[PDB]
Design a protein around this ligand. Structure first.
Ligand SMILES: [Zn+2]
Ligand SMILES: [Zn+2]
Ligand SMILES: [Zn+2]
Ligand SMILES: [Zn+2]
Ligand SMILES: [Zn+2]
Ligand SMILES: [Zn+2]
Lengths: 196, 214, 196, 196, 191, 213
């Protein structure tokens, strides 16, 4: 028996990832009790994001600019490129503070079943970026379709000069063997680095 | 509300076979010991988290733990023993001013990076003690009161005079440090290290001093 | 280190109740990957909600109309009014299908501590609606400030004619005593109905 | 290990214990002394033999009567029937009851095979006498509900007064997030306050 | 008595203890009996193993005595569970040695209570030792020390890889692990 | 992970606080476990449940109540429900029809003023749709048409020449015979007199005992 407007707002809210229809309702109700400033501003912020910020031409990471801060930035080496599934993934690797290279962001992981070939990911323009005497670190997720995408990219990239690497599969920080999954364990065990 | 989130460093970590992890944090708001059932919350992490307090549960629960920074190097054997020490201080002093936090913080930083870890641990050791209001007493013998005692004191962990002393005098380097010890800045107190050869005396020294106070 | 737009959008997102700053970021990133249709529509839905739907003059329930569907609706008896803290609370009671009366939505409880007197709640216009020979069921929550609010309203309403009731405090359905809180238990125990 | 299989499976036995929960417990158990483990089984079997069911109302005790019965300071006016022992405890807790409990030891289920025989009903009837009160503290599951209903329509011939612990919304809970059944029943069960 | 003795064990709170004691009162003399029976059979009949300290009954665990397993390599794990979950992966036919803790100075744990010393005999010329202690700084350190102590004897020291676990996305993986799986990265195509 | 619509035809607990439960859905019967609608016996519910090799008894994530029948607790309607659901559990292992039927059963045993009658009728229809038909026309021993004697061993009907006990009364016979043909509508209109039901009860009991487990 809901006001039409309400049902719209709720639906749109429910479209967002993470919002259960329940949550979407609660969220709309609360959205109501708020002033018109509050709203006109939220909606404004959205529209201004839609309009302003876009995808960098070099690595397809987000920016309002003509080149993502990371590409433009001079302290960084074009000697290496880290290929990664999504922008959040750049943020996450960057927080680690442990990587000074460049990035490439696909925005997808090959899924045939979901209809996703590399006509969909940003795989094509990666190619002219690689050449003789560079590294390409392959940073897709440990998910099957990630791993797969990694593989496909190794094979695609082989012809052109660069070295090719895969971020280590293994056990994360502050884990115990007791409480880690057989698969991961196996990988870590085989993939062990030797020292002496 | 009874639910607060704060910034910290894990100066203690423990488990009960259930899989529940009790933990002691050092925050600028003082030390705080919170429990969580299940940053993966690692010893020496610089972390921050939401924790829930109340009469419901008298040891604070833990909801979301998130890592800010961390120092891996501290595992390698040297820097390791020294860390565990520094944190044991942070736990014994600073009884749950932010100053202590920024200090012990600095301690872990320097015991991680700086090339002479044992020196970091001596200096920061006595600064950690000092800010916490425990000062080695030097100018007056512990027994008779004679100025400029130069000998070890087994019982009190202070300094005795050759007349009131069983053991020989702490070497000049160790003495000079001991005396001018708590006055100098970290900056310029790192520039004046005790020779390697004379540290062991100075260690054995600090050990009983602490044992007897703390 | 993000384009300014991004930070805005993220902030606004975080303002929403339930959105952890983490969640707000994830939420904006994903918001990005969606088409411009998707967005302009979400924002549109918001603004159209802010504009269209308001508070019903009789009971301050939500609607886009001049009277909430519940007030306008004829099958219902003005003999009774259920006073209830928030709109969601109406929805909730209505689902129960157990109630044919009218409603009143205060839109919050009494919190002196948070600076909330019955100049903030919609208490004043409830009054002309009550009179001789009606029931007022007091539907505020079992929270202290709810209880409190109920009480205040009983005393306020005493002078005019109507009967006054309080929704039963006690144990919910399919509960076990073993696993219910001492307070609730106590209430149920004292509040027991006698039959034979 | 043949007998570690014993221990650990014998753990998987108890409720609350899964396979790796059993593991965890067996292993953690191997690190206790002969002392701990010993006195553990000791307390275990002392609990087996030394204490038993109580005939009067079937709350667990050691001696010839539970401290609810034998202890004379408690009033004989009222008896309170609860589903099981825990119910007895959590009920004492509320601090609202100085009377008698009688323990049925289970609810009425025909499917599951439970008749009011294994149920301690029959031994209840002697206890109810002219002009007393009996309160029905069986749980609110349809099974406990029915159990009560039966208990009343059976108990009404003997002169005592039958009351049953209140169904409603539990202390400190808001309607929006309370279920339709409970709401409905706290809507109907509602007490009155102010009458003309 | 029973119930407090329940609150004892880990995983058991006060009303968890209640629930269990009570539910226990409704078992037979049989159940409860054989329960304590298995309890004390577990006490006496089985003990620590002197070679590598995995729990067994007989004079050796089935990892040691059983000749089908290779002696080339020994794998050091924090505790028995570790042994199990490690066998599970189906990736290892060799030897485990169990150091019955990790190294913590604060907590007071020295490599004495730890089964390190009894490890040294087992490592011979030209073998491989893999370090399966956990990844907590304490397990980390433990390993580090185990290597810098173990390098004098001729065997080969390797340590289980740090990185992002199977089936997980970076976005939601922590900065420390990410960084270490960024550095630890293996190479695939070289020119 | 799938979500479906159901009715709880069985309910159970292990002291851990975990509730194992049997549902009847139009997709057939489904037995799911939930650790921790509060999910009550005879509720008409709907829920999300999670399946896999991880756990071989289906877990339960979100349980939401659609409709419910409180009346079923009052002693009469109660015994009768528990029965109907015990049927739903024994047959129906699979066509939605059974679900809409047993459904109707609970409805009618809840509201209709003569609950025992509902229970008899719906009893034989529940059995029937499930392909268990009282065999009437032919004596169970000799094969003689139109037997009117209760048979103890098989739960079928014996002729006078092949029967130790006296004949089921005419009401109970008429029902028994034309039992499975009539519609709920017009089979409610022709109830066995109260006095003759107990025979017809004791009848149905052995019949079921002998077929169903
Ligand atoms: Zn770029
Ligand atoms: Zn002196
Ligand atoms: Zn209205
Ligand atoms: Zn008793
Ligand atoms: Zn062994
Ligand atoms: Zn015959």
């Amino acid at each position: 028996k809901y006001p039409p407007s309400l049902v719209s707002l709720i639906r749109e809210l429910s479209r967002l990832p993470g919002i259960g229809p329940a949550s979407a309702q609660a969220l709309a109700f609360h959205l109501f009790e708020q002033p018109r400033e509050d709203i006109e501003r939220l909606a404004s912020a959205l529209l201004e994001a839609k309009r302003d910020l876009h995808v960098c031409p070099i690595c397809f990471n987000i920016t309002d600019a003509e080149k993502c801060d990371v590409c433009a930035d001079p302290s960084r080496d074009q000697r290496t490129i880290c290929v990664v599934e999504e922008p959040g993934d750049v943020i996450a690797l960057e927080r680690s503070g442990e990587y000074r290279g460049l990035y490439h962001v696909l925005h997808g992981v090959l899924s045939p079943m979901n209809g996703v070939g590399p006509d969909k990911l940003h795989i094509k323009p990666l190619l002219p970026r690689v050449g003789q005497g560079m590294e390409v670190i392959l940073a897709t997720g440990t998910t099957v379709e990630g791993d797969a995408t990694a593989l496909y990219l190794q094979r695609l990239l082989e012809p052109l000069g660069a070295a090719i690497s895969r971020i280590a599969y293994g056990v994360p920080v502050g884990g115990s063997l007791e409480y880690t999954d057989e698969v991961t364990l196996g990988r870590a065990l085989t993939g062990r680095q030797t020292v002496s | 509300s009874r639910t607060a989130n704060r910034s910290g460093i894990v100066i203690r970590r423990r488990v009960t076979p259930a899989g529940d992890i009790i933990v002691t944090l050092l925050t600028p708001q003082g030390k705080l010991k919170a429990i969580a059932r299940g940053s993966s919350l690692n010893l020496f992490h610089h972390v921050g988290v939401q924790v829930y307090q109340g009469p419901h549960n008298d040891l604070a629960s833990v909801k979301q733990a998130v890592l800010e920074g961390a120092l891996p190097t501290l595992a390698e054997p040297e820097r390791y023993a020294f860390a565990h020490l520094m944190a044991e201080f942070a736990d014994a002093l600073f009884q749950e001013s932010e100053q202590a936090f920024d200090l012990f913080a600095a301690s872990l930083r320097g015991v991680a990076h700086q090339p002479d870890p044992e020196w970091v641990a001596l200096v920061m050791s006595y600064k950690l003690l000092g800010l916490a209001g425990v000062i080695p007493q030097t100018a007056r013998c512990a027994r008779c009161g004679a100025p400029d005692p130069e000998h070890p004191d087994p019982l009190g962990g202070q300094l005795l005079c050759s007349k009131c002393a069983a053991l020989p005098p702490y070497p000049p380097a160790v003495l000079d440090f001991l005396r001018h010890a708590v006055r100098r800045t970290v900056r310029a107190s790192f520039e004046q290290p005790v020779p390697s050869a004379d540290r062991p005396a100075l260690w054995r020294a600090l050990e009983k001093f602490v044992t007897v106070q703390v």
